[PDB]
Design a protein around this ligand. Structure first.
Ligand code: PC1
Ligand code: PC1
Ligand code: 3PE
Ligand code: 3PE
Ligand code: 3PE
Ligand code: 3PE
Ligand code: S12
Ligand code: CU
Ligand code: CU
Ligand code: CU
Ligand code: MG
Lengths: 282, 75, 35, 59, 116, 160, 68, 165, 53, 196, 98
């Protein structure tokens, strides 16, 4: 990870770096047992594993319908559900999910709503999604055009579309003539001005005073809400063994940086993933 | 051969000889049924004991399994 | 004079209204239950 | 015998595979008359092969 | 006898076979059909907290080259580089998440760049 | 066993039959309030969901594709891709959609008590002592011919 | 080892943020806000310095010395 | 299946009550005993095969889903093979009986351990009802069941060796 | 089992007892039929013994 | 000559032990039968009384039993040795058996014309010494993923997701079959695995 | 098809038993059925068998259908999934079900 740039969010760039980094010549563990895989196998320890797919898929569904497919936890759950599920059931369930069957508000999975009403609501929701996606695509294209006018934005855009990943991207661009030393110097100058502004107490104090009310409100809300979260969590914990059923633990498994499992090792903490809608990608 | 176990043990001495012999045959069948059962149960429990020993000696100083396999609690 | 308050079962979801495109021609001749 | 991956157009290959034509991973170990067996199968008399098998730690 | 014992053991030990909907309600409260899904609080993070119903060699170490737990390997690696070893008890940052931190950084970066 | 043992066994079997019959009828009667409350809750949720989706669609229509200002790009958060978000969460995070969610909730609650006047009664039972205190709640639901105004809907995946 | 280094970096960041969370929960909101703002200051300085790090190969040896 | 069930019931009944005076149940010659045990085998298993075939017919005709992608083809295999192995021993045992009888007729000597052979025949008959799933070791059976069925198959192997000796 | 619906507690008031009950089974009518067959069995046994004696 | 896995080696050794036992028994019975027949055909050694011997019968019933418990124990341990490597994996592969072709991670594999019946256009690749989990099923009817030279043979049954653990030690191409009647093109539905 | 095949086989056996009982009624009317009649014995045994099978079927029905919760009314009290913690306009937190 020398020439890699985290900020860039281009799918082609991330794909090239995925091919470079997740290559099996260096990234494949030898004689390593991952506790996540061991536990998942130990819970369902027979050859008949029809029962794991539904459970993990439903965990991911709860995560997604409550927090959205963009949450890293829900991405982790989706990765696991894909791994431990056979693509036939997975294809069927994805087809059902597209039709808003699993939606937490008007889906038939979570609600006792008749077919006609469900169809009306599902069509309305899909129309809403279509319109918002159109608007978001236009806005993203505009931002792409606009970000190319900034000095540093120009450099990032040029690097994001280089034909191959390079140990030294800027040097290989400039020696190839695509990036101009004048633009590089201008971007460096802007960054230097901003950096110097951060260091000194005058501009800092200006910024720190301009941003204190929102931070204070967030701190107050977090300190107040944490208690109620614990109260409701305890009340739910009472429901743990009330009946023979199972209580979900939304989210089932979160991204763990202190104890990294197989997901964090394979996908670099969610950096190298398939680019599909089920992973919250456009 | 299968001698009459109930004669040297003084069991079922209030029945005719033929019925006593039937009881002896049933007892002998019971004895022969429980041989292989005993062998296989003993082997299984030895295997479990050896598994516990191996886990306690391999994960003795581990960080993850240093208290379950290390102590043999839930081998 | 009291009703039956049992919750009805859930048999067929809407997204599975076609039954996976499975042939259902009963021997009588029409795709209907004998009843 | 070797798998002809160069005669198949548009065949998926792993990024971490050795594409040299004469690599070890392209050999066909079984289901072909060989005269030089690379796999020990259940029908192979090692005595007929003079027990020229690899060690245990290796393999 | 072997057949009878095998059937009884299956009905007693197997996790997926539950005599819940197969016996009159008067006897039902003696059954816990979902126990396998509720073991270890339901969390799939620590084998040996999850029952494994095998006749033998349930937890037998593998052959070939004995596998090293990933977190043990990371503990050794981290201590080799001078950083702290694996915590094994640390919890998640439920409050003040990575997204909130990134948003704060974003706003101050926007202000500093704007009023450079 | 003697015939007396078999008579005792028949007595136990008869007792089991009687207990099953009583439990069956008691359960059939006792779940009416809870099923009614569930039906009303899902009805209200469906109406509120439709109202919020219609509001969101109307607001989106008003945005001109020729030029999107910051406010719109801030109202709909058009920076996070649609498949990367939960629309229903946007009614629990963004203040504007939070206010409209509250207003639509009040409107739907006002409307429901009109078409389902008895709903308020259940509200008293659930509010005071929780869902558990409806197992044998007496009220206007103890009538086989009593019409709850649902037209056989919002009770199952098919009309009742 | 590359993934090892990446993990150590991310873990350090999480531990700092977790200490900030503990402060948020336990101490006064004003103190928490000041802690958050100073942490953001240092993190953004790191981000901008990392951005400048990319341009080092193709920058003049003089200017490169004024911030390194 | 119907024909076999009728024949089996008839053979058992005739052999149990119509023996002439002075002939006990276990003194009837070897062939009759093997036919009796074969008949007992056929009686106990054919109804299960009938259930399996009715399942197939219902799936084909009324378009149910007992043995479909949402069904249990393994359930079909279990039922069929529960019938399957008893059929095999039904086939083999009468050959043992006939060979024993003919041997008595052509070697001009009695069967060595006639009681032993009769008991071994009934043992083979009984043990054949507990081994049906050794024809499904790759279906995906539980590991414990695989071990159990290997054990039971060896058990059935023993008395046949006694008979050969 | 894999089910089209939800059968986890604490998401709805009537979901935990969904997979565990097939309500449409004609319960008390089946009870009446069982009573009829018990009548038949006991009457027939009594009469059979009576004629035999 | 390498073995290509450890499970195959264990199975082979168990097979050899059973072969030795059965060959010994066959030789003993062959000697006995040779003596009996040689005496018989020359009209020697006749005794109509010799129709019972309690000791001999009891011993010949006991002997097969003691020599069989060993075989049973060895077989059970071999089964569990096959099944232990589950849970120590880091790669998952899913396999679908279509009607006369296979699918690996949504990539189709059909027979080719370069090889007669053994070779395939798209193989399935796994890494050497790296434990992998195969999740196998089928779409239309029952097939059987069969690579018996690595000790894998698991049925792909519709609606039933089987899960086997595969491990490779020798680099090369292993050829396998459908090993289950599936239709007309059952004989032309081969399997190719490449351990690299 | 499972529950229905069970009940349909039972119904078929009930029909055949009805035929047998009708024949036995006819013969009893004519006075041809004595106290030691094997027709009487067969009808008695068959009737007892079918009734016993129905007893077991009723037990199975009330096993699958029933549940102690159905008899006990064990409902939750929280609805965790559809319950979110939010801060109202006033500033103090609140709990409501979405
Ligand atoms: C399950 C067991 C089924 C077979 C029972 C056979 C005995 C029997 O039917 O006894 C009860 C009686 C006959 O018992 P009994 O009164 O003749 O007692 C046996 C006779 N002594 C005591 C002298 C040894 O039969 C019936 O009631 C007929 C219906 C049988 C099914 C009853 C199920 C009840 C639950
Ligand atoms: C279900 C499977 C059914 C087929 C198999 C049945 C086997 C019954 C064996 C009974 C037995 O052996 O009984 C001996 C006993 C022997 O009786 P017995 O002769 O010893 O008793 C003395 C009788 N007296 C003194 C009056 C002469 O016979 C019976 O019980 C009568 C059996 C009659 C069977 C034929 C029925 C005749 C009517 C035609 C009906 C055909 C079906 C119609 C379907 C209509 C559908 C809409
Ligand atoms: C419900 C009814 C249906 C049935 C279902 C239930 C089934 C239950 C199972 C019954 C059958 C049991 C079979 C025998 C169990 C195996 C015993 C065992 O675990 O042996 C351990 C032995 C060595 O262990 P290992 O891990 O290889 O150690 C290497 C370095 N120490 O392992 C090995 O060497 C590999 C295996 C070889 C074959 C086993 C032969 C016995 C082992 C010899 C004894 C152990 C030797 C240890 C040294 C000290 C002994 C004094
Ligand atoms: C005289 C003795 C019997 C002789 C049998 C001769 C035929 C042998 C074939 C065996 C099985 C045939 C299966 C075909 C019948 C299909 C029945 C059917 O359509 O079932 C649906 C019906 C319930 O319909 P449902 O949707 O619940 O109703 C909605 C509102 N009530 O559910 C039912 O109607 C279920 C009926 C019971 C299940 C079938 C078991 C056999 C009983 C015979 C029934 C009639 C057979 C008709 C066959 C015609 C050709 C002869
Ligand atoms: C006679 C009635 C026998 C059946 C009794 C069932 C009710 C008791 C019960 O629930 O037993 C506990 C257990 C079933 O509970 P469950 O949680 O469904 O299963 C464990 C998960 N595999 O079931 C068991 O532990 C097994 C119960 C039956 C074991 C003995 C069977 C033979 C009895 C003599 C004939
Ligand atoms: C004497 C007649 C009865 C013989 C009974 C012998 C019992 C042997 C062991 C039964 C058993 O459990 O076998 C395993 C087999 C499949 O096992 P599997 O489904 O993989 O494991 C449970 C997965 N949750 O399990 C099965 O396939 C289920 C077998 C159930 C028992 C059926 C017995 C036959 C009933 C009808 C005839 C009875 C009279 C003859
Ligand atoms: C003359 C007669 C000879 C016939 C037999 C010899 C022929 C060859 C056949 C030999 C073997 C015959 C069959 C006998 C072998 C059967 C072995 C068997 O049930 O294990 C028992 C099982 O492991 C242990 O069960 P346990 O009670 O611990 O309970 C379970 C606990 N929860 C567990 O899970 O931990
Ligand atoms: Cu067989
Ligand atoms: Cu095939
Ligand atoms: Cu095939
Ligand atoms: Mg097969």
């Amino acid at each position: 990870m020398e020439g890699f740039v985290d900020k860039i969010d281009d799918n082609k760039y991330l794909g090239k770096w995925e091919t470079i980094l997740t290559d099996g010549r260096t990234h494949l563990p030898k004689h390593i047992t991952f506790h996540d895989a061991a536990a998942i196998s130990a819970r369902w320890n027979q050859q008949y594993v029809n029962d794991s797919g539904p459970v993990y898929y439903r965990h991911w569904l709860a995560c997604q319908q409550t927090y959205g497919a963009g949450n890293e936890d829900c991405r982790k759950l989706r990765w696991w559900a894909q791994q431990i599920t056979h693509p036939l059931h997975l294809a069927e369930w994805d087809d059902w999910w597209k039709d808003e069957h699993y939606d937490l508000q008007i889906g038939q999975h979570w609600n006792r709503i008749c077919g006609e009403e469900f169809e009306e609501a599902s069509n309305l929701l899909k129309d809403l999604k279509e319109k918002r996606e159109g608007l978001a695509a236009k806005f993203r294209d505009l931002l792409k055009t606009k970000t190319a006018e900034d000095p540093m934005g120009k450099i990032l855009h040029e690097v994001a579309q280089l034909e191959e990943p390079s140990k030294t991207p800027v040097a290989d661009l400039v020696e190839a003539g695509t990036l101009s030393k004048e633009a590089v110097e201008a971007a460096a100058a802007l960054k230097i001005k901003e950096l110097k502004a951060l260091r000194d107490d005058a501009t800092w104090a200006e910024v720190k005073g301009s941003l204190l009310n929102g931070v204070t409100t967030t701190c107050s809300t977090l300190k107040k809400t944490s208690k109620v979260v614990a109260e409701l969590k305890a009340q739910a914990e009472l429901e743990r063994n009330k009946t023979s059923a199972v209580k979900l633990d939304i989210p089932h498994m979160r991204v763990n940086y202190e104890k990294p499992g197989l997901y964090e090792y394979d996908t670099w903490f969610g950096k190298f993933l398939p680019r599909t809608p089920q992973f919250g990608f456009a | 051969v299968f001698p009459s176990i109930t004669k040297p043990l003084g069991l079922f001495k209030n029945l005719p000889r033929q019925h006593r012999a039937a009881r002896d045959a049933s007892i002998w069948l019971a004895i022969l049924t429980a041989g292989p059962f005993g062998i296989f149960i003993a082997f299984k429990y030895y295997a479990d004991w050896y598994d516990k020993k191996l886990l306690m000696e391999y994960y003795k100083d581990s960080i993850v399994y240093g208290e379950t396999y290390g102590k043999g609690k839930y081998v | 004079g009291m009703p039956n308050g049992l919750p009805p079962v859930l048999l067929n979801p809407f997204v599975n209204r076609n039954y996976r495109g499975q042939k259902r021609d009963m021997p009588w001749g029409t795709d209907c239950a004998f009843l | 015998p070797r798998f002809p991956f160069q005669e198949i157009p548009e065949i998926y290959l792993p990024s971490d595979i050795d594409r040299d034509p004469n690599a070890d991973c392209w050999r066909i170990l079984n289901q072909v008359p060989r005269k030089e067996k690379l796999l020990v199968e259940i029908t192979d008399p090692l005595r007929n092969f003079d027990f020229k098998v690899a060690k245990i730690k290796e393999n | 006898c072997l057949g009878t014992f095998h059937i009884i053991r299956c009905l007693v030990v197997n996790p997926e076979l539950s005599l819940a909907k197969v016996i009159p309600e008067i006897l039902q409260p003696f059954t816990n059909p979902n126990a396998q899904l509720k073991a270890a609080d339901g969390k799939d993070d620590d084998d040996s907290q999850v029952p494994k119903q095998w006749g033998m060699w349930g937890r037998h170490p593998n052959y070939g080259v004995l596998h090293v737990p990933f977190l043990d390997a990371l503990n050794k690696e981290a201590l080799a580089r001078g950083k702290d070893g694996v915590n094994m008890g640390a919890e998640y940052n439920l409050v003040f998440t990575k997204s909130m931190a990134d948003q704060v950084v974003d706003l101050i970066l926007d202000d500093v760049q704007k009023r450079v | 066993p003697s015939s007396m043992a078999w008579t005792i066994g028949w007595g136990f079997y008869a007792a089991w039959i009687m207990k099953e019959t009583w439990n069956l009828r008691s359960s059939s009667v006792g779940w009416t309030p809870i099923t009614l409350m569930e039906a009303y809750k899902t009805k209200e949720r469906y109406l509120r969901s439709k109202a919020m989706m219609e509001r969101y669609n109307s607001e989106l229509e008003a945005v001109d594709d020729s030029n999107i200002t910051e406010e719109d790009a801030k109202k709909f958060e058009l920076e996070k891709a649609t498949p990367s978000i939960s629309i229903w969460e946007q009614f629990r995070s963004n203040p504007y959609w939070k206010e409209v969610e509250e207003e639509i909730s009040t409107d739907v609650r006002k409307t429901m008590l009109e078409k389902h006047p008895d709903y308020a009664l259940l509200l008293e039972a659930v509010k005071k002592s929780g869902y558990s205190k409806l197992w044998h709640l007496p009220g206007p639901w103890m009538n086989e011919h009593y019409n709850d105004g649902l037209h056989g809907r919002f009770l199952g995946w098919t009309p009742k | 080892p590359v993934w090892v280094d990446y993990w150590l970096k991310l873990r350090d960041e999480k531990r700092i943020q977790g200490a900030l969370e503990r402060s948020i929960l336990e101490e006064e909101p004003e103190k928490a806000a000041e802690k958050i703002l100073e942490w953001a200051r240092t993190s953004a300085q790191n981000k901008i310095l990392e951005d400048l790090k990319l341009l080092k190969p193709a920058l003049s040896p003089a200017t490169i010395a004024q911030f390194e | 299946g119907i024909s076999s069930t009728i024949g089996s019931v008839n053979y058992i009944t005739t052999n149990k009550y119509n023996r002439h005076v002075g002939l006990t149940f276990m003194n009837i010659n070897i062939y009759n005993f093997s036919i009796i045990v074969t008949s007992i085998l056929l009686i106990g298993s054919l109804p299960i095969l009938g259930v399996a075939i009715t399942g197939l017919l219902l799936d084909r005709n009324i378009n149910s889903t007992i043995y479909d992608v949402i069904g249990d083809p393994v359930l079909y295999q279990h039922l069929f093979w529960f019938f399957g192995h008893p059929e095999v021993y039904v086939i083999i045992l009468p050959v043992f009986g006939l060979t024993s009888l003919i041997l008595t007729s052509i070697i001009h000597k009695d069967i060595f351990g006639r009681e032993g052979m009769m008991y071994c025949i009934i043992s083979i008959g009984v043990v054949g009802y507990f081994v049906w799933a050794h024809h499904m070791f790759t279906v995906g059976l539980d590991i414990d069941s695989r071990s159990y069925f290997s054990i039971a198959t060896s058990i059935i192997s023993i008395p046949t060796s006694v008979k050969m000796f | 089992n894999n089910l089209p619906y939800n059968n986890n507690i604490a998401v709805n008031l009537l979901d935990h007892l969904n997979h565990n009950n097939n309500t449409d089974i004609c319960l008390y009518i089946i009870l009446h039929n069982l009573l009829l067959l018990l009548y038949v069995t006991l009457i027939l046994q009594l009469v059979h013994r009576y004629v035999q004696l | 000559m390498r073995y290509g896995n450890r499970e195959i080696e264990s199975i082979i050794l168990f097979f050899d032990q059973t072969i030795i036992l059965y060959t010994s028994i066959i030789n003993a019975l062959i000697v006995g039968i040779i003596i009996i027949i040689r005496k018989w055909y020359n009209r020697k050694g006749i005794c109509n009384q010799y129709i019972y011997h309690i000791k001999i019968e009891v011993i010949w019933t006991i002997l097969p039993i003691i020599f069989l418990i060993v075989i049973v124990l060895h077989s059970v341990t071999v089964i569990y040795n096959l099944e232990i490597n589950k849970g120590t994996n880091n790669k998952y592969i899913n396999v679908i058996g279509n009607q006369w072709y296979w699918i690996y991670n949504n990539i189709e594999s059909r027979i080719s014309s370069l090889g007669r019946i053994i070779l395939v256009d798209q193989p399935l690749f796994i890494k050497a010494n790296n434990n992998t989990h195969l999740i196998i099923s089928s779409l239309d009817v029952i097939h059987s993923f069969a690579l018996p030279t690595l000790g894998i043979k698991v049925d792909a049954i519709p609606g039933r997701i089987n899960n086997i653990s595969i491990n490779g030690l020798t680099q090369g191409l292993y050829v396998g079959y459908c090993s289950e009647l599936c239709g007309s093109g059952h004989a032309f539905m081969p399997i190719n695995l490449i351990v690299y | 098809l499972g529950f229905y095949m069970l009940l349909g086989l039972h119904g078929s056996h009930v029909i055949f038993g009805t035929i047998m009982l009708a024949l036995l009624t006819l013969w009893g009317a004519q006075g041809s059925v004595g106290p030691q009649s094997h027709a009487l014995r067969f009808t008695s045994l068959y009737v007892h068998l079918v009734d016993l099978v129905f007893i077991i079927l009723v037990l199975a029905i009330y096993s699958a259908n029933a549940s102690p919760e159905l008899y006990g009314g064990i409902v939750p009290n929280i609805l965790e999934a559809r319950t979110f913690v939010s801060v109202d306009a006033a500033g103090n937190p609140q709990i409501k079900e979405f």
